[PDB]
Write a protein that binds this ligand. Structure first.
Ligand SMILES: O=c1[nH]c(=O)c2[nH+]cn([C@@H]3O[C@H](COP(=O)(O)O)[C@@H](O)[C@H]3O)c2[nH]1
Ligand SMILES: O=c1[nH]c(=O)c2[nH+]cn([C@@H]3O[C@H](COP(=O)(O)O)[C@@H](O)[C@H]3O)c2[nH]1
Ligand SMILES: O=c1[nH]c(=O)c2[nH+]cn([C@@H]3O[C@H](COP(=O)(O)O)[C@@H](O)[C@H]3O)c2[nH]1
Ligand SMILES: O=c1[nH]c(=O)c2[nH+]cn([C@@H]3O[C@H](COP(=O)(O)O)[C@@H](O)[C@H]3O)c2[nH]1
Ligand SMILES: [Mg+2]
Ligand SMILES: [Mg+2]
Ligand SMILES: [Mg+2]
Ligand SMILES: [Mg+2]
Ligand SMILES: [Mg+2]
Ligand SMILES: [Mg+2]
Ligand SMILES: [Mg+2]
Ligand SMILES: [Mg+2]
Lengths: 217, 215, 215, 217
């Protein structure tokens, strides 16, 4: 069932809980291949990139089970969600291609919105009126960003509104498809940045004091 | 060398010529796994998805040779270039990562602009930067000519274009994957009125497809 | 249906015809990223690596349709079929995993035999089993005719062949990727005296290559 | 330097230590997409498949640094090492293809040996005389298997002999390139089996009592 009353947006009603990552649990950067521009600044790896992919596969499957045979409009929140969104749509298409169930509806219709008080850079949001919408976000912390953007999308009157977020911090709005629950720390790598740096690093790391001082501004 | 005169933008001066795909050269869709939503509409495949990936690896290496050791700002033109851009940035990061060369600069810095008019963040941050515009296809050359003039006003250090496909139908790219005949393509992020982006291969738009998804 | 009479082995009875690659149809090596050790020797690419992967996905789906819900024993013929086998088993596991169908049987059980004569574990365990022999290429058909007779003696339940390539030069496979002209291929696990297996694309053996790596 | 005196075989002399996985550290199977034939039997995931790939990348790089421009003969121990070996050779070729250093020597020359008192099913081992050999193994526990096979290969007189093993158990011979150090438990998945079952599962799991009883024989 793709239906979900608008009023439920951000409640995480009937969700599958995310993978819980306890406090002070990290891998050492030295065990991974870290590139020279990252070497001085990465010490602790919270989520290896291949752990992120394995988790995204399970989210995708959850998503496909929810919307199969229903038109689905998926919104990528740029820039941060690029990595997670591109993995997710790759899985969604593949799952639908291999599924024994056959549908005449594509697996998803993609959209982009850039968020940076919330700023909204995007096409006219009216195209989402009466559509099933899935917001793909990289990380929710206080919930402010998705609460404001959600309020603005509700105004157009979508048919349904759900949230897929790769990480939620333990500090509030909650996503419907969430990969990981982590302790309240600043993360970089795997598309997470610190003043635009580290996005190209393959793993989700903790921001180091060395990084923070070198790239603060 | 990353340096290149701004006046050379769109001239494809000194480029490596793309892979030339001759007219009326196609693979049969029946030889590929085609999902149900595309099955009635896809007959001819111009570029198998795997061939796209092999060519994008060669372009990433060409781009790595050009910009290695220099700050590189890459602009994705949405929505069409999403797939090419995502493949390209993955190969650039990997190539640098395995190169055995030491650089203190990341392999790229990413940016996004949506064209259809323009929609983007403030463009003045490209001043005195090395910029690579990544696009899905160049046909008349109008889109990149127009966006190019807009960017030239902020005074970048250099401007190049990477385009997966150029049609033989005139602006040209610097890193181009394939030269094809003048036909409307769909699949691998190419669409016909927002349809077929998710198909894994580059195909020609058939009659059946044109009819059902018409204006 | 997994069932198939043992007497039909090698006849390609009821198969889906492979992708036909016409004579003198090649891509230029200069359009691909070719590593230094292959660079002097590779000129023409018959099958880009990505095209191989796209076709292997279609074969895995064909094999999934045939054996789903039945115990399937897959034999890799070493060393040549390593690459095809590894791609095939990855796609079969994934296809089953995402199929949304419930089966209590794994997508395959793997086995290995080395031919050049035979080298393998005891073959009697294939008695009353559904067997799929995975091979890199069939040319005269001698290798699979001979190994086939050996296996037939243990009384399998059914026997089929998956071959990535068949040359038009006669035994034929049941799941075949490509029909090519009669030429010696190298790359993508195809070798010339143990050379070129690691190259990512299927290429023709050139003169330069023949000379340097000769008998 | 590819050189290594034969006498050092199995000592792990001058190795990079593996990634240490503490006792009683597992992920829950429920957080992953587990296929129906595995669902009843997998409970605890020790090493997510994408964690294995990220670690294999770092081993490959270590291996490339050791043998670049030197002829390298790599032996896959079947059936168990298939997964690890195929990931490793894919990385090795790619690293050499992207390397700024150029060599006229291929990244590796592959070989297969099936081990099951040790049984050795293989081509004539004499082809390894005076060659640099790397044995690729899935898991070392007591060290018996690699000690016996190593003794048999020494007899032919290779130039050098090193061991790459994805996992070593904490119970003895040691590998030169080792991915993980784990507690002494029986593992399945990601090519590890229990009486031929579970190899196709994507993650390295702990054998469950339910699995053991269902597949014992
Ligand atoms: O790179 C990042 N590492 C983090 O640890 C982190 N926490 C929050 N964010 C981003 O900052 C904002 C926080 O989201 P909230 O509005 O819910 O507080 C949004 O823009 C979030 O995407 C992060 N970005
Ligand atoms: O999906 C598509 N299939 C095509 O065959 C095709 N040809 C051009 N285009 C898009 O339309 C414009 C063509 O660009 P020009 O300004 O160079 O003519 C740009 O916006 C191009 O992306 C295509 N899009
Ligand atoms: O690398 C290769 N490139 C080729 O073009 C080629 N043609 C045949 N073969 C191998 O030689 C034998 C051919 O099999 P037949 O028994 O069917 O003739 C089998 O052992 C095949 O694997 C090739 N190997
Ligand atoms: O599937 C497996 N899960 C395990 O936990 C495990 N421990 C050892 N092995 C295999 O059994 C033998 C043990 O190696 P040792 O000779 O060093 O004891 C060799 O055949 C090893 O590869 C395992 N296989
Ligand atoms: Mg953001
Ligand atoms: Mg940010
Ligand atoms: Mg466009
Ligand atoms: Mg378009
Ligand atoms: Mg062979
Ligand atoms: Mg051969
Ligand atoms: Mg073994
Ligand atoms: Mg075993």
């Amino acid at each position: 069932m793709a239906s979900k009353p608008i009023e439920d947006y951000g409640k995480g009603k009937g969700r599958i809980e995310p993978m819980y990552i306890p406090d002070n649990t990290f891998y050492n950067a030295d065990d991974f291949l870290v590139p020279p521009h990252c070497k001085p600044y990465i010490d602790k790896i919270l989520l290896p990139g291949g752990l992120v992919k394995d988790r995204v596969e399970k989210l995708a499957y959850d998503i496909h089970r929810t919307y199969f045979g229903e038109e689905l409009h998926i919104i990528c929140i740029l820039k941060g969600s690029r990595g997670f969104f591109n993995l997710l749509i790759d899985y969604l298409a593949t799952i639908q291609k291999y599924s024994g169930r056959e549908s005449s509806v594509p697996p998803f219709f993609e959209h982009y919105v850039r968020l940076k008080q919330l700023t909204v850079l995007s096409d006219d949001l009216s195209i989402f009126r009466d559509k099933h919408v899935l917001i793909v976000e990289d990380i929710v912390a206080t919930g402010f960003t998705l609460t404001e953007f959600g309020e603005r999308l509700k105004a157009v009157g979508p048919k349904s509104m759900r949230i897929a977020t790769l990480v939620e911090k333990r500090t509030s709005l909650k996503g419907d498809f969430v990969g990981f629950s982590i302790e309240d720390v600043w993360i970089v790598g795997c598309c997470y940045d610190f003043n635009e740096m580290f996005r190209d690093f393959d793993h989700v790391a903790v921001l180091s004091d060395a990084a923070r001082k070198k790239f603060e501004k």
